[PDB]
Each structure stands twice: as structure tokens, then as C-alpha cells.
Amino acid sequence: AKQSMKAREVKRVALADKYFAKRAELKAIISDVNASDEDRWNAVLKLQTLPRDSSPSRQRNRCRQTGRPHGFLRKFGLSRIKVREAAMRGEIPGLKKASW
Amino acid sequence: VPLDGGRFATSDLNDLYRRVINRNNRLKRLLDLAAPDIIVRNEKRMLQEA
Amino acid sequence: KKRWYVVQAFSGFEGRVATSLREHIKLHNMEDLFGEVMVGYVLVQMVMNDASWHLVRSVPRVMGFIGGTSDRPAPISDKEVDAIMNRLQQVGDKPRPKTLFEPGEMVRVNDGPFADFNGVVEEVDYEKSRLKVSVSIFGRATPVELDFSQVEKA
Amino acid sequence: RIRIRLKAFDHRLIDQATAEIVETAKRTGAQVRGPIPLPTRKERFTVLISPHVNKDARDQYEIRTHLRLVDIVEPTEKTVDALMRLDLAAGVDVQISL
DNA sequence: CCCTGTCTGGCGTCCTCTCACCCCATG
DNA sequence: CATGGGTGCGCCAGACAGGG
Numbered sequence: 001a002k003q004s005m006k007a008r009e010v011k012r013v014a015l016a017d018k019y020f021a022k023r024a025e026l027k028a029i030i031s032d033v034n035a036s037d038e039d040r041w042n043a044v045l046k047l048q049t050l051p052r053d054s055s056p057s058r059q060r061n062r063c064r065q066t067g068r069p070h071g072f073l074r075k076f077g078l079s080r081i082k083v084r085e086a087a088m089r090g091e092i093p094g095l096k097k098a099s100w
Numbered sequence: 101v102p103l104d105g106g107r108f109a110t111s112d113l114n115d116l117y118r119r120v121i122n123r124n125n126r127l128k129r130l131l132d133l134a135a136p137d138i139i140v141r142n143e144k145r146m147l148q149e150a
Numbered sequence: 151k152k153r154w155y156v157v158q159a160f161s162g163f164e165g166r167v168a169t170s171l172r173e174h175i176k177l178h179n180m181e182d183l184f185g186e187v188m189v190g191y192v193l194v195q196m197v198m199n200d201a202s203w204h205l206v207r208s209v210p211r212v213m214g215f216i217g218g219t220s221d222r223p224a225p226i227s228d229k230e231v232d233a234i235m236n237r238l239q240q241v242g243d244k245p246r247p248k249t250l251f252e253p254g255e256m257v258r259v260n261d262g263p264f265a266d267f268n269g270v271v272e273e274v275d276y277e278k279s280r281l282k283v284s285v286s287i288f289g290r291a292t293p294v295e296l297d298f299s300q301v302e303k304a
Numbered sequence: 305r306i307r308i309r310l311k312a313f314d315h316r317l318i319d320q321a322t323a324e325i326v327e328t329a330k331r332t333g334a335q336v337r338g339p340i341p342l343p344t345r346k347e348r349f350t351v352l353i354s355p356h357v358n359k360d361a362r363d364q365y366e367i368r369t370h371l372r373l374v375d376i377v378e379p380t381e382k383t384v385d386a387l388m389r390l391d392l393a394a395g396v397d398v399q400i401s402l
Numbered sequence: 403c404c405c406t407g408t409c410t411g412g413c414g415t416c417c418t419c420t421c422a423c424c425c426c427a428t429g
Numbered sequence: 430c431a432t433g434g435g436t437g438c439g440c441c442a443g444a445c446a447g448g449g
Binding site for chain 2: 156158191216217224226227228229230231233234237
């Protein structure tokens with residue numbers, strides 16, 4: 001499903017693992033109450049000179065197999081189509097057509 | 101193999117190999133925490149003679 | 151000035167060799183020619199006259215000095231003597247407990263049935279003085295609580 | 305003294321496996337509290353099945369995970385190794401808190 | 403260097419049949 | 430309990446000093 005758009009997703013998790021969780025500290029407490037002068041104002045300037053990527057909001061959470069952006073499931077990592085064909089096979093443990 | 105009584109009648113080569121291994125373990129200990137030259141010269145000399 | 155020398159004894163009778171050596175000193179009253187005796191090798195603070203050399207080799211269960219030659223035997227060419235002394239001091243020294251620990255930090259177990267195993271401390275309890283670390287038993291990290299002294303910091 | 309909390313997806317497996325986890329304990333430690341079941345977490349995922357329109361055909365799914373407790377009584381070193389080191393049944397989580 | 407004395411090693415028959423006894427020692 | 434600390438043989442022969 002648009003192998004370039006799969007490749008655009010894989011570069012965004014790398015930048016989120018190189019800059020942020022390590023440079024989210026500039027927004028963590030340097031955007032909190034302290035010496036809130038131009039020291040704070042510089043830090044609010046200094047995170048736009050980071051790439052427009054590398055923030056986790058840019059990540060889409062496509063399917064792990066098909067890369068389908070809609071219909072994602074954050075328990076398995078697959079889309080709704082690829083979870084159903086796998087579950088009826090027996091690729092997913094402890095799951096079945098249930099009814100209550 | 102043991103004798104009639106039960107005490108193991110041990111061969112001579114087991115004494116020789118057990119001596120060489122006792123001395124080699126002592127010399128390796130004299131390489132970790134170790135000890136001065138005269139000590140490791142006697143230790144290596146006893147290993148050579150063993 | 152009294153310099154050090156190395157004496158070889160029958161290994162196993164070493165304390166009795168040290169006691170007999172102190173007693174031979176206080177028999178033949180060359181008290182100004184011997185400083186100490188440290189404990190299969192016996193360390194002797196000494197000077198070198200041939201009389202004191204015959205004295206130490208006339209002490210029973212003593213083979214002889216260990217040096218370059220038997221004419222003028224050799225004092226102390228310290229190479230790993232300091233290392234051995236430091237190791238002994240640390241061993242017989244107060245073992246510092248592994249109090250400093252944080253979540254995700256690997257630790258080491260040397261007590262109980264989990265002895266000789268490593269793991270990580272998922273949770274810590276300074277108030278209860280207990281560390282929550284799991285030890286891979288048959289692969290399954292068996293989360294168990296161990297004291298700071300029961301485990302070592304990795 | 306030691307909480308033994310074990311999780312697995314199959315009920316005929318987790319309840320079979322709890323029979324021997326006290327048989328490896330009452331053989332040596334000779335005192336266990338008792339097999340305590342725990343209310344199971346049923347996670348449901350009901351989701352579409354067609355690759356396009358007809359959002360009225362869905363298939364209800366459910367993954368049931370179970371939990372059991374036995375909470376062994378005696379902390380004697382023999383019993384400790386007979387449970388901590390001796391973990392059985394692959395596919396069955398077991399986690400212990402002393 | 404060319405002969406002479408010393409210093410260590412290497413070796414000394416084959417089959418059998420009993421017996422007796424195999425590391426203290428000790429803080 | 431577990432380890433470690435005699436002085437009666439005689440010839441040949443070649444290698445190592447030792448004069449020579």
C-alpha cells in the first residue's frame with residue numbers, strides 16, 4: 001500500500017527515537033513555571049529548529065502488515081481485515097468467535 | 101578402582117595430574133590478586149618441576 | 151633500617167612456624183635484628199647478617215629463603231604485593247550494601263535459592279528495605295523480593 | 305507467604321496446571337492455602353469484516369484471560385526452589401511476589 | 403685445537419605359585 | 430577432615446670439561 005508511504009512512516013519513528021523522549025524536556029519543564037523570561041522564550045523558539053518530523057503526533061500507526069492507515073487496532077498492530085483472517089486461522093492466541 | 105576393604109587404591113598419575121592442577125590454580129590466583137616477583141618465580145618453578 | 155624478606159615453611163604449619171620464630175628470636179636475643187612476622191610463605195622484617203640467616207634457617211620446619219641466590223637472599227621486589235594487600239583489606243573490610251538502585255537497573259543475587267542469578271529491579275521499596283527484582287528461572291524472570299545485601303548492584 | 309499469581313488463556317490448561325504446582329509444593333512444603341480463582345478479564349474487539357461498505361456485518365470477538373492464586377504458606381528454602389526455579393506449562397504466565 | 407679425565411646415563415632371562423600390605427594427623 | 434609434606438654393581442659409551 002504505497003511503499004513510499006510505508007517508508008515515510010519508518011523514518012518518523014527513528015526521528016521520534018532520536019530527538020524526542022530526550023528533547024521533549026525543552027517543552028516539559030522549560031515550558032513550565034520557573035524563570036519564565038527569554039530563557040523560556042528561547043526554548044519555545046528552539047524547538048521549531050528541530051525538524052517538522054520527530055514529534056509523535058506525526059506518526060500515523062499504520063498496519064504492521066498492510067500499512068492500512070484506517071481501521072487500526074492497538075492491541076495487535078494489524079488492521080481490521082488482517083486481524084480477522086489471522087484469527088480464523090489460529091495465528092492469534094486465545095481468540096474466538098464468542099457470544100454472550 | 102578400590103581394594104577389598106573399600107578405600108580407593110589410587111594410581112600414581114592421578115597424584116601427578118592433581119599436583120599439576122593444584123599448582124596451576126595457585127599460579128593463576130598469583131596472576132589475579134597475584135604477589136611479588138620472587139613469589140611467582142617460585143610458583144612457576146614449582147609448576148615447571150611438577 | 152630493617153627490610154622485608156620471604157620465608158618458606160611447611161605449608162599448613164605456618165602459625166606454629168611464626169610462633170617458633172618469635173620464640174627463637176627471644177631465645178638468642180637478637181631483638182634488634184627482627185621487627186615483625188606477618189602471615190605457605192612467612193613475611194619477616196629483618197636485616198641480613200649471616201648469624202640471623204642461620205637463626206631463621208635453624209627455626210624448625212623452615213625450608214629457606216626465596217631469592218635470587220642463597221649467598222645474599224633477596225628482600226622484596228613488590229609487583230603485586232600491594233594488590234594482594236588491597237584485596238585482603240576489602241574482603242575483611244565492611245561490605246557496602248547495594249542500597250543505590252533504580253527501576254530497570256540490573257542487580258545480582260547471591261542469597262537464598264536465587265543465588266548466582268541476575269535480574270532487574272522493576273520496583274523498589276526503601277521504606278520496606280526490599281527490592282522487587284525477577285530472576286530468569288527456566289527463562290521465566292521470577293519476580294522475587296531481595297534485600298540490598300541479599301543482592302549486589304550490577 | 306508467597307503469592308503465586310498465574311495467568312493463561314485456556315481454562316482447561318490453567319486449572320490443570322494448578323494441580324501440579326501444589327503437588328510440587330505439598331510434596332515438600334506440605335502447606336498451601338488453596339487454589340483461588342480470580343475474575344477473568346474478557347477483552348472484546350468487535351470490528352468490521354468487509355473491505356468496504358456494509359457497516360452492519362460485524363463479528364464479535366473475545367479473548368478471555370484467567371487468573372489463579374494458590375498463595376503458598378511455608379517459606380522453607382526447599383519449597384522456594386520447587387516453585388520459583390521449577391516453572392512448567394509453556395504458554396502459561398506465572399508471576400510471584402514474595 | 404688434540405688428546406685426557408670425569409660425570410651421568412642405560413642396561414642387565416622367561417613362565418608360574420602363594421603370602422603380606424598399601425599416608426599421617428589433627429586443630 | 431582432607432591435603433600435602435643411604436653409604437656392598439659393573440661395563441660401555443658418549444658428552445662435557447680439562448688440561449696439554
